[PDB]
Paper text:
In this work, we show that unencumbered views of the changed, non-ground state can be obtained by recasting the problem as a multi-data set, 3D background-correction problem, which allows the relevant signal to be extracted from conventional single-data set density. Our new method—Pan-Dataset Density Analysis (PanDDA)—comprises: the characterization of a set of related crystallographic data sets of the same crystal form; the identification of (binding) events; and the subtraction of ground state density to reveal clear density for events. We demonstrate the power of the method by applying it to the most demanding type of changed-state study, namely crystallographic fragment screening, which attempts to observe in electron density the rare and often low occupancy binding events that occur when a relatively large (200–1,000) library of weak-binding ‘fragment' compounds (150–300 Da, 100 μM–10 mM)1819 are added individually or as cocktails to a series of equivalent crystals. Applied to a series of fragment screens, PanDDA yielded markedly more hits than manual inspection of density, far more quickly and all with high confidence, in both known binding sites and new allosteric sites.
An accurate estimate of the background can be obtained by averaging near-convergence density, in real space and after local alignment, from dozens (>30) of independently measured but approximately identical ground-state crystals. Using an averaged ground-state map for subtraction, as opposed to a single ground-state map, reduces experimental noise in the ground-state estimate and thereby also in the event map. Furthermore, averaging over multiple data sets minimizes the influence of stochastic variation between the data sets (characterized and discussed in Supplementary Methods). Finally, the averaging generates an estimate of the ground state that can be used directly as density, bypassing the need for any subjective modelling and map interpretation. In contrast, PanDDA directly eliminates the thousands of strong electron density blobs with no statistical significance, objectively identifying only regions that are unique to each data set; the ground-state data sets are provided by the many hit-free crystals. All crystallographic data used for the PanDDA analysis must also be made available so that the analysis may be reproduced. Retrospective analysis indicates that ∼30 data sets are required for full convergence of the statistical model, an experiment that can be completed within hours at modern synchrotron beamlines with fast pixel detectors and sample automation, and that needs to be performed only once per crystal form.
Author numbering: 1856 to 1970
């Protein structure tokens, strides 16, 4: 509350550390469905159904330009990419499997870097 704060957790390396995680997600062999925005002209239904499209290149640009206020808003966008994927793709598809795999890969790196 006013003049009552928990001890100050050091957040000075968060930017650099999120950048490293995102590099690792970008270079994963199963990243290919997620590297670029879904083409809303060429994929029927996507625009209407997925209210908030997100992809790795859009996260990279937001990160590099100071549009994440803290590490939690970064994680929310990464999770949005996988939540979108699950909304549009059957589990038993190459893309649906890719999204599950990448979500796991991310959540481990997230815990090991910060928790």
């Amino acid at each position: 509350s006013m003049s009552v704060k928990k001890p100050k957790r050091d957040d000075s390396k968060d930017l650099a550390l999120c950048s490293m995680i995102l590099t690792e997600m970008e270079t994963h062999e199963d990243a290919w469905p997620f590297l670029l925005p879904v083409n809303l002209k060429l994929v029927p239904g996507y625009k209407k159904v997925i209210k908030k499209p997100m992809d790795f290149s859009t996260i990279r640009e937001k990160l590099s330009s100071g549009q994440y206020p803290n590490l939690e808003t970064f994680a929310l966008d990464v999770r949005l990419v996988f939540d979108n994927c699950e909304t549009f793709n059957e589990d038993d598809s190459d893309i649906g499997r890719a999204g599950h795999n990448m979500r796991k890969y991310f959540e481990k790196k997230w815990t090991d870097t910060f928790k």
